[PDB]
Every structure is written in structure tokens, then in C-alpha cells.
Structure 1
Amino acid sequence: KRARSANIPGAILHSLAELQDGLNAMIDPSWRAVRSLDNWALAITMESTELLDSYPWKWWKNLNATPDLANVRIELVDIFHFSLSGAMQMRSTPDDEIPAASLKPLKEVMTTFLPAKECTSDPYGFVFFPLTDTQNAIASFRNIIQLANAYRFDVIIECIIYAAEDLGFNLVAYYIAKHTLNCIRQLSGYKDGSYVKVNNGVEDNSLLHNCIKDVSLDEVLDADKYVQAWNSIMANVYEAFQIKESDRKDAERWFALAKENRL
């Protein structure tokens, strides 16, 4: 009876991509025509440094500070949205519109940073473990930025998956939770500026950690249990933000909206 590792099966990645398409479409219905590949690379760039800022990297300020690993988890998930969006758009881009950099050998467009102390890494050698270590984090995310510059969105997804497994959290479960917060934000005036993220005292991101305490690694990838497992996660997030039933969506509605779109 074999154990399901932390790799995301193809079938599940498809479903993840359908959710992502739905969220992107809430933002702009023609998101593929409107967004550029550079947008997603930029967004990954910004989230990467925002992640690094969770570590005490600064030698001139706040010594005796420890990494804010709760925030690292959310930032990884944010990067995952943007890379998944980027990988999808890559597949949707015409060939004459393909940036030359995406096709040149990686070694030509990138320098791989390595930490000074011995460590293990992901299979590509871009991300370094343990990620509780600031120097490992720094080298990893300087590599992610350069991957984003060479449009390697699929390599990035792979790296995030190993990153989540090092840090010991359920990436897919967090994805579902953050996806749901993202949808909530779009329903509640994120664009026009009326939304309150740091409401009552806590950042809205911080409420998600409790919404996924129940879910298991297998439970969220098992072809039998996953739709239900994803749905309870969505429900937990919706309920936490006091979102009415009529405004909610379930995983199957997202699959239906995506399929309806491919026509």
C-alpha cells in the first residue's frame, strides 16, 4: 500500500488550473488577452522579495528576529497562483509572441545562487533546504526571480511544491483557502479600495491557517475525496468571512465554468 508523495498529479493540477482561470476571470473576463507574460513574472518577482522579507535578512536592524514562517506559507501560495497563471498563459500564447528568453538554454539566462553552508536542494538545484534557514531562503528566491525572468513558470511550480514539503504544510489545501479569500476580496471592493484586509486587528490571510487544520495530504489529492475536501475548505473560508450562500461557489461550479469557457 504505497504512500502518495508531494507531487501534484496531472489531473489535480488541471482542476487547480480551472479554479485559477475562474479567479483570473473574476478579475478580467478576457484575462488571457489582457494580461502579458511579463505581468506574471513581475508578480512572482514582487512576491518573492515579499517572502524574503519574512526572514531577518537585514544586518543593520532587528537582530534576534526569527523567520515569520506563517507568512512564508501564504507567500508561497501567492507565488503558486501567479506561476500557475503564467504556465497557463504560456500555453495560450501564439508562437510568434513567444519571448526568445523562454527558449534559450537556462544557463545562458541565469546564474544559480548557492548558499555557503552545505545543504540539500530540490531536483533542479534551485531551492535549498531547510527553508527555516534565511541564507537557504535567500539563495532560493533569488533563483526564483531569475526563473521568472526566463518565463520558466512550470519549473517554478515544481520548486514551490518541494518548498511546501520542506516547510511541512499542505500546499494544495492552502491554495484552496487563499483562492477562496481572493474571490472574497474581488466580491468586496478590492479594486475600488473599499476592502479592509487588516480588520479588527488581524490580517485576513492569518485566518486561513485555521481553515485547513483538518485536511490531509492524501485527502486533498485523492481522486475519490478531493472535491469534497476542497469544498469543506472553501466553506470554512466563506463562513469565516461571513459570506452569504448566494455569493459562494463550489469546486464543481468552477469546473463547469471552465468547461463552458472551452467552447
Structure 2
Amino acid sequence: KRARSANIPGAILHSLAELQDGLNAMIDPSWRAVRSLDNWALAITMESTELLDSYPWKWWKNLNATPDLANVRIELVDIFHFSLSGAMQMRSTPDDEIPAASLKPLKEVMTTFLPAKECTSDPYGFVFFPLTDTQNAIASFRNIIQLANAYRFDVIIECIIYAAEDLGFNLVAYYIAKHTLNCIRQLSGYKDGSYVKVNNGVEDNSLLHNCIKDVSLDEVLDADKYVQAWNSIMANVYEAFQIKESDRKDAERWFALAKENRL
């Protein structure tokens, strides 16, 4: 009986897209009309450098620092949100509005950065392992920025999947946890000043780690168990931030809202 890998199945990625759609709609109901392909590319650019700032890349400051891999995990998940949004916006975009660079061959619109020291990479050759190494991370994310600039949101999703695998965490489980926090943020006034990330010492991102301790790679991808698996993660995050029941949503509600919008 064959072990399931990290290589998110089509059906699972569609369900993820429905959650992403729901979250984006909380932010603006007409989000596909108001957002641009460049917004998502910019967002990925900005998170890519935030992620890189988790590593000790600076030679003039804090010379003995080590990588903050907990922050890297969350940032990879943030990049996944934006890339998934971009890949789905690209499917929604009319062909006369499709930017020429997305259709040009990659070689023409990017130069691939390689680390100096021998390493393994993902199948495209854009991301480099191990990601515990700062030089590997630097070349990887310099490559991701260039992919974003040529609108290759789907290539980026693939890379992030291989990255999560190298770093040995459950991408999908983290996605669900952060997706739930993102929803909580919007409910709680992130747009105006009302909600702030830092709450009496700790960043809100930091509470998600315990919310996904009890989930397995299979639990979260398996057609039979995933809806319940996802729902328990949402529940853990909601309960962590003391969100009343009437404000919560379960996975099946997000699928339903996605489907009715599909009319």
C-alpha cells in the first residue's frame, strides 16, 4: 500500500482554492475585478524578502544569528496564499488582458540564481535544499521573485510544496491554520486600526504552531478524513483567539459559498 507524498492532489488544491476565494471575498467581494495580477506578484515579492530576513544574511550586524525557521514556515504559507490567489486570478483574466511576459519563455525573462556549494534542488531547478542553509534560501527566493515577475504563480505553488517538504512541515495544515487567522483578522478590524498582530508580547502567527501539532500528512490530504481534519484545525485556531461560535465557519460552509458564487 503506497505511501502518499507531499504533492497536493488536484481535488485538494481545488478545495484550497475555494477557501482562498472565500478569504479574498471577505477582503473585497469583487476581488477578482478589483485586484490585478501585479498586486499578487508584488505581495509574493514582499513576503519573499520577509522570509529571507528570517536568515542571517547580513554581514554587518548580528553575525552569530541563526535562521528563524518558525517564521520561514509561516512566510511560505503566506506566499502560498498569494500565489494561489494569483494562479486563480490568472484563470479568471481575459486573454487581451494577459501580460506578455507570462507567455514568453522563462529563459528570456529570468536568470536562475544558483548557490555556490553543491546541493539538491526541486525539479524545476529554482529552489535549493537544504533550506536550513542561508545561501540556499537566498538563491531560492531570488528565483521566486523573478517567477512572480513573469506571473508563474503555478510554478511558485509547486516550489513552495517542495520547500515545505524539505523543511519537514505540513504545508496544507499550516495553510488552514493561517487561513483561519486571516479570517479572524478581518473579523476583528485589521483594515482599520482595531486589530494588531502583537498581543501583550507574542505575535499572533506564533500561536498557530500548537494548533497543528496533532495533524498528519495523510490526515490532511486523504479524501475521507480531510474535511474533519481541516475543521479541527480551524477549531483550534478559533478557540485560541476566543472567537465566538456564530463568527466561525467550517470547511463545508466555505465550499458551499464557493459553489453558490459559481452561479
- In the superposition, the TM-score normalised over structure 2's length comes to 1.00
Q: Structure 1 residue 163: deviation in Å?
A: 0.1
Q: Structure 1 residue 196: deviation in Å?
A: 2.1
CA distance in structure 1 between the partners assigned to 2:127 and 2:138 by the alignment? 9
| Secondary structure in 1 matching 2:223 | coil
Aligned residues: 263
Q: Map Cα deviations across residues 231-257 of structure 1 (whole Å, 9 max, x no partner).
A: 000000000000000000000000000
Q: Map Cα deviations across residues 5-50 of structure 1 (whole Å, 9 max, x no partner).
A: 0100000000000000000000000000000000000000000000
CA distance in structure 2 between the partners assigned to 1:193 and 1:98 by the alignment? 36
1:114 aligns to what? 114
Q: Map Cα deviations across residues 207-262 of structure 1 (whole Å, 9 max, x no partner).
A: 00000000000000000000000000000000000000000000000000000000
Q: Structure 1 residue 57: deviation in Å?
A: 0.1
CA distance in structure 1 between the partners assigned to 2:133 and 2:196 by the alignment? 33
CA distance in structure 1 between the partners assigned to 2:7 and 2:196 by the alignment? 35
Q: CA RMSD in A?
A: 0.3
Structure 2, unpaired ranges of 5+ = none
| Secondary structure in 1 matching 2:57 | coil
Percent identity, please. 100
Q: Map Cα deviations across residues 66-119 of structure 1 (whole Å, 9 max, x no partner).
A: 000000000000000000000000000000000000000000000000000000
CA distance in structure 1 between the partners assigned to 2:130 and 2:75 by the alignment? 17
Structure 1, unpaired ranges of 5+ = none
CA distance in structure 2 between the partners assigned to 1:105 and 1:197 by the alignment? 40
Q: Structure 1 residue 205: deviation in Å?
A: 0.1
2:223 aligns to what? 223
CA distance in structure 2 between the partners assigned to 1:109 and 1:185 by the alignment? 36
- In the superposition, the TM-score normalised over structure 1's length comes to 1.00
CA distance in structure 2 between the partners assigned to 1:56 and 1:231 by the alignment? 36
Q: Structure 1 residue 150: deviation in Å?
A: 0.2
Moved over 6 A (4+): none
Q: Structure 1 residue 197: deviation in Å?
A: 1.0
Q: Structure 1 residue 186: deviation in Å?
A: 0.1
